[PDB]
Amino acid sequence: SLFYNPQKMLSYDRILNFVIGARGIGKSYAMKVYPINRFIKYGEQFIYVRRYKPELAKVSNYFNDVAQEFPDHELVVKGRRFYIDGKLAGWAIPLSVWQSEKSNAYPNVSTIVFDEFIREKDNSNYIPNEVSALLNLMDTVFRNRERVRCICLSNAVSVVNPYFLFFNLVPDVNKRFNVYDDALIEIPDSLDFSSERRKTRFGRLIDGTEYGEMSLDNQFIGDSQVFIEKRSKDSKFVFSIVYNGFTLGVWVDVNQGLMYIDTAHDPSTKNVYTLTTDDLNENMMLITNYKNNYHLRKLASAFMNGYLRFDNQVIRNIAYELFRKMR
Amino acid sequence: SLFYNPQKMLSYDRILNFVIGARGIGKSYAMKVYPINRFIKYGEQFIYVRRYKPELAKVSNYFNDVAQEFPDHELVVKGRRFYIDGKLAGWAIPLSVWQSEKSNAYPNVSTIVFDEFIREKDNSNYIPNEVSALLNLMDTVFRNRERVRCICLSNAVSVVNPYFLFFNLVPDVNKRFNVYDDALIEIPDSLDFSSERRKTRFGRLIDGTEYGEMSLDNQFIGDSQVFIEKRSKDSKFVFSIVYNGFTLGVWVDVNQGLMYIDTAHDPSTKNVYTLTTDDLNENMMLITNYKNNYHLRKLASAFMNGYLRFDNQVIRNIAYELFRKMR
Amino acid sequence: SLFYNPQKMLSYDRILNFVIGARGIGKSYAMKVYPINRFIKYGEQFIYVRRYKPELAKVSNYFNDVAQEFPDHELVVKGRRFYIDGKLAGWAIPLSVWQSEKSNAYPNVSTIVFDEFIREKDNSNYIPNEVSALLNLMDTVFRNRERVRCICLSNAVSVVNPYFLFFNLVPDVNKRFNVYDDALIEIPDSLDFSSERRKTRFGRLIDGTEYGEMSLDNQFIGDSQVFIEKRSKDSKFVFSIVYNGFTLGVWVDVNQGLMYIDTAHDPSTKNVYTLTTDDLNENMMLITNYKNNYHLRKLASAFMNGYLRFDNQVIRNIAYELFRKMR
Amino acid sequence: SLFYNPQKMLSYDRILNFVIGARGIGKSYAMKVYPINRFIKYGEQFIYVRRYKPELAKVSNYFNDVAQEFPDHELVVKGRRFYIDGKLAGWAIPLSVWQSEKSNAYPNVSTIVFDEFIREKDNSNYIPNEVSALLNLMDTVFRNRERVRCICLSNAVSVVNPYFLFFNLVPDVNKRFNVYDDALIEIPDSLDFSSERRKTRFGRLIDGTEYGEMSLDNQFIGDSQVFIEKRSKDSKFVFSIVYNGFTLGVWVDVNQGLMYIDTAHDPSTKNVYTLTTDDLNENMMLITNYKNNYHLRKLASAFMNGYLRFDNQVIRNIAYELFRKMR
Amino acid sequence: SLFYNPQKMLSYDRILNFVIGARGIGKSYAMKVYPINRFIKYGEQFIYVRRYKPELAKVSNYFNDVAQEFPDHELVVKGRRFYIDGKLAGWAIPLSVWQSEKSNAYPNVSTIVFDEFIREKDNSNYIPNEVSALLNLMDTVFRNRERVRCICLSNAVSVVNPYFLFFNLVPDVNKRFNVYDDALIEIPDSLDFSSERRKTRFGRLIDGTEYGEMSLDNQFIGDSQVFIEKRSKDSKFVFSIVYNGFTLGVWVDVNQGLMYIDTAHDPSTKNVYTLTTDDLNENMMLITNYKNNYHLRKLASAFMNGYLRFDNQVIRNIAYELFRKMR
Ligand SMILES: Nc1ncnc2c1ncn2[C@@H]1O[C@H](COP(=O)(O)OP(=O)(O)OP(O)(O)=S)[C@@H](O)[C@H]1O
Numbered sequence A, B, C, D, E: 001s002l003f004y005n006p007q008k009m010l011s012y013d014r015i016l017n018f019v020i021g022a023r024g025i026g027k028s029y030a031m032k033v034y035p036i037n038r039f040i041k042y043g044e045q046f047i048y049v050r051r052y053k054p055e056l057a058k059v060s061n062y063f064n065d066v067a068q069e070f071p072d073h074e075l076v077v078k079g080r081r082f083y084i085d086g087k088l089a090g091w092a093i094p095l096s097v098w099q100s101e102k103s104n105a106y107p108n109v110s111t112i113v114f115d116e117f118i119r120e121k122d123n124s125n126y127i128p129n130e131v132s133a134l135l136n137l138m139d140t141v142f143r144n145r146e147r148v149r150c151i152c153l154s155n156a157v158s159v160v161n162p163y164f165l166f167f168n169l170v171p172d173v174n175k176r177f178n179v180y181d182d183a184l185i186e187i188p189d190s191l192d193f194s195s196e197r198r199k200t201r202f203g204r205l206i207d208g209t210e211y212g213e214m215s216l217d218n219q220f221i222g223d224s225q226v227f228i229e230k231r232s233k234d235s236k237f238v239f240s241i242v243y244n245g246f247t248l249g250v251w252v253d254v255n256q257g258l259m260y261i262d263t264a265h266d267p268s269t270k271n272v273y274t275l276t277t278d279d280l281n282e283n284m285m286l287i288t289n290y291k292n293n294y295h296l297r298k299l300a301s302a303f304m305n306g307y308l309r310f311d312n313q314v315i316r317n318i319a320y321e322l323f324r325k326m327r
């Protein structure tokens, strides 16, 4: 039948599953045809979350088109109310319109799906405190923790969303499913998706020119800050510096005379330095602004040239801000 | 002659036309007539995007100035929706919520019936990457390669907006048309320019001399952004200043000594200078505040003098911004 | 009389009505009444024009104070709607919001209405492209050759303002009215101001004592920067600069050896000091805060001493602003 | 008694009523009882005045605490307007939105009330020439002569004020009312000082410590800043300064070098110096780059020593800010 | 004891209340439970005082536990307010804006809530005269002190802060209950986080992640501000200084080359240093920052290395700041 069925991501037993990164043409129908069926089978109530209030008028549609699947049950949709057997089965909620839903009747639900969670192509429009609210949302509208499902379908090709900014996820393009103790990021039908888009440019060559626009192909490309060098030695080393309560050693090597800055503490503890007296101690000395720079003339020249290398991007940023303060 | 004349625009028949000029001077007249002409031919309904929502509460009189074009049949508005003899005419919405629209069926489109797509000196209105927003709009008004023909229409001619140089849309003041695969750059006849500007000279003499200023001249002729003297020559590559991710270099031609800022490459592997740490890696060298004025002594002096010359407008803008950064 | 009516001013029929200062002369309510009379007797629509959107309370602040003076006619206030004798002809017009203007069809308004024209010590966030904005509005409404008038009044006598400077008008207290090829200027009388000053002094001693204060003088006579010395002379020419639009040319007189500043410029290949590259070209020269001071120490020491006299008021203004920039 | 009593305050009944002292002792409530007594029995309309937008929005609550005073009448705030007995009784107008509001309706005005006309522990957050905006208000309200009042209320005696310094008044700390033909300066009674202070002490003992805190005394008896040394002597002077439109003389003592800054400005061709660029005369000299340090060495050292002595509070402060601007 | 009991704090029932050094798990839990229950049983209004504007969105997320203690009370978040059972409970405002909202009088406030009056291990930028502004608020809202309290919670144990120095407090952190006439200082037992956090985590892991908010971890950790030894020496002093109204006298012990910073300083003819004009008087001597080193080279050197000593861990604050004034 259909290539993709959410049965795998449901049976994974993971509390949090994220079907994010595809069109949703088959996906949304796939996991919208099941919940009404679970209601009819085991009285299992269901909630869909639209991104915001005006989307309530866009959710009444599907009950009509699912007619072929649901012949023998009376189908009614009344704003938020979902009526099957002339009875309440599901509820659709906006994120900002939440107050009236706090006292609303949600006896037992194990599904909350976010669709179009990001306002697509607004000026990064933010819904106030999405996840700071969502924590109490999950613990409140749902009954318990045993068998609770918090899912997010996506249509936008999002390298990250503010929800991810909170949870701080680290997925990969390779792993179709990204499973953890709690969470699971799923990238749907990646090849077919791409193929499913290919064919539409055959239906319209001007859409071929539109695809040729680097904007369409650059949302498949992520951008961020990147590391510089990941280096270490196996030989002698001399200096030591500390800043903002964090210590950075200095490594040297005679072979090519190279110079690295890697984590190294010397209980011998000579010439330990800071830029600012917020890290004062009887051992360290408040460095003169630039004379100590000339003392570390080799370090200065290594910064000017390529002779300075490091083993982290975090060490990169700390060292770089120190360099900016150095002059 | 007399008015705005879309005959050549319709004639050369790009699937996507691109015209500019005539601020309020019928740049919207003929193009609001044309959808009703398609309706008298009994074609398809049109789509009207708006920049924002308040702009909608007053604009229900969209057919007032086309009655004197076509007094014959019924051209009215029931409210938000436009009706010609009672049949649906225009799908009329601002930008904010097109995503909620994009799952609806849109089988009938005729033409693009919006103007002031981009306003001069107006980016607070703008939405980030709205060029791809128009891409989503077009693909959600596409069913095949037919039924659609598009126009852009800015009040004046500029060469700095992302769309142009993204498509290398280059205006020509000697010739009316500039032709590409699908993109045209045009303006009404220079003879029609003479006729209509002379018509404005007639009557309100103050409204004529206000056109005598370049203030009202540039709105319709579009002579803008060509500010610095600019040339090019065959000198040798000497220096290159990697700034914010650019391979900018300097040609120095001693015969008739001037510095030309054209872009090129040689395997110099030296003399490449960076003014930021983000553009620095382990094969180029960093330069602090003053040392640019000394190592690029030729650059500094030729900038202070009139001896510095330029090649391209984008290079001119980024170089002046750099000249602001260098202190 | 009590409240002068501007028909004698309107007699000349130039579109621009530059009335300045006149705190409390009743130009406000005269320009309220006049379009009402025009609509009543002929049928011409009217629009109350301000600069910004946020003011909505001016539904009642404009129309109540002038509602009663009409003896035997009907008026209706419907928010942004104004009705005279059951005829809808009046609405509020914001300038900061230009976009709604470019959608709205123009009501046939004989004269645009505007007082509080000048900004006195505002936050300086006025409308950019201000004179261009007024030109765009004038072109937008009545694109035909039918003539349209405008009335604009300033709270206090600011001798130079962006539009006044822009169209190179010049003020003259001695002659109340002023006429050019396409311009009309006007100044308030002194008899009415004297009468009102006696009214305040005899009425209450608070404003009787406040009359001797500077601010009340400014409310009638409009104290400006004219007080500083302002003369020119026919001495020999010495030096020349260009500053963001004005080509200052400075003369020197050995007799008493002072220095004079005039807008007259000597066409000469001598070095011209440009403070900003926005005036850079082949022959001008860019200079920074040190060497301009070192080579124009003549000018600077002459300025701190009593050794400068300016030809024109705008010359004084631009010279002082430039000196502030240099400081 | 404990309540704030305005009987002797109205005993003179002048329009400029600077009411000082008794921080937060219900003087503002005693005000609030007044415009009710005026409007209800007479129909006159009142004006509420405060600097900034938060105090514009929540003025209803400041009227809500009035909903207990007059039971029979109806007191409702619609929008940001006060309705007493179902009729419009007053308006609350902020200052910063001032110019546009100059054209507000004043069919009749009773009292323009402004708490905290002195700034409270802030950083120069005075609307520049706030006095100009206030006096423009009184000018605009002055169309209906009879019974106009402009009440301004504060909480501490302070010659550190644009107001008192601007009107060149000499306040007193013991004369219960410093009166002129137009204005009043009120220091509250003595018995109620003790009454409220014992009230604070009895209610709580850290309130007694506040009674030991000099801040409470300043908010009760006022800071005249008389503490800084002050004297004068017949001895002559060397230099002469003008700052912020005020002359200034530097008396020099024959013996002991006790420098005086008394206002002894003899009209002389002697050298006179300023620092603010607004001060320029044909007779006097400007000073820059710390030349004044090399001219008045003895004054600089004398202030850096205990030698200097200031004749007047206005003189003393003005010298302070001049020193602040010097560096 | 597993649960902190705010009964312990209100058993001593002092008006001035400082709950400091809490871990903010059980202390925050109980403190959150306290006030709404107190109002519900009796009735009270509360103010949620905070630092700045960016934290205005944090207040809307506060009832994650209290509603759990109220299975039958519905607390609805209305923007920046809370409604208990549909009734406006109190209000939440950033502290600094209160100065603008200074003069507003509120009916009868019982508990004045504040959190983290001391902000530890950060920038900790504090507006000048914060304590004076807080006392201004206290004076503003109070006439009758019948059972009114000002409660503040901070998660730090430290005697160096604006408030303790302001009130001349000397609480010893080793103990757990120091008292003043109307103030109380306590340190809650650290073992209070357990039964609040790892019980609800030991239940289920997804519950432990439900705890979260990612901010409890900052408060739980504790740090000691002591850097070097604090001692007093029996060798006599040489120089003395006065800073921001806080005196100081530097002592020297030639043996072992030490210097001490005991505040106890002997007045004599030797006039002290000063750094700002306000602090200056008719007897003391003031110096510029550069000549400060040329007076106390030994102070300079003791700031370079670790020669200088201290007498109290709070003194190190004044020393650090005055060092920064040296620049
Ligand atoms: N075929 C035409 N017949 C008559 N007038 C025309 C014709 N074409 C253009 N015009 C002129 O165009 C004016 C109205 O054109 P508009 O629709 O305003 O064009 P526009 O440039 O879009 O200006 P805006 O900003 O859209 S209102 C009329 O008042 C005429 O002066």
Ligand SMILES: Nc1ncnc2c1ncn2[C@@H]1O[C@H](COP(=O)(O)OP(=O)(O)OP(O)(O)=S)[C@@H](O)[C@H]1O
Binding pocket: C003, C021, C022, C023, C024, C025, C026, C027, C028, C029, C030, C033, C066, C069, C115, C116, C153, C154, C155, D103, D143
């Ligand atoms: N038709 C009228 N009926 C009655 N009073 C009028 C009329 N026209 C003007 N006035 C008077 O004009 C006086 C001045 O009010 P405004 O009309 O606001 O003056 P204004 O000239 O706009 O002041 P400026 O120049 O804008 S600062 C008022 O006191 C009115 O009584």
Ligand SMILES: Nc1ncnc2c1ncn2[C@@H]1O[C@H](COP(=O)(O)OP(=O)(O)OP(O)(O)=S)[C@@H](O)[C@H]1O
Binding pocket: D002, D003, D004, D022, D023, D024, D025, D026, D027, D028, D029, D030, D115, D116, D153, D154, D155, E102, E103, E104, E105, E140, E141, E142, E143
């Ligand atoms: N008749 C009254 N008797 C006693 N206290 C009163 C009375 N009327 C008001 N108050 C109280 O006075 C206090 C301060 O209110 P305000 O009227 O604003 O004081 P104020 O004198 O105006 O000083 P500010 O700076 O305006 S708050 C409040 O606590 C009121 O409850």
Ligand SMILES: [Mg+2]
Binding pocket: B027, B028, B029, B114, B115, B116
């Ligand atoms: Mg148009």
Ligand SMILES: [Mg+2]
Binding pocket: C027, C028, C029, C115, C116, C153, D103
């Ligand atoms: Mg006016």
Ligand SMILES: [Mg+2]
Binding pocket: D027, D028, D029, D115, D116, D153, E103
């Ligand atoms: Mg008050």
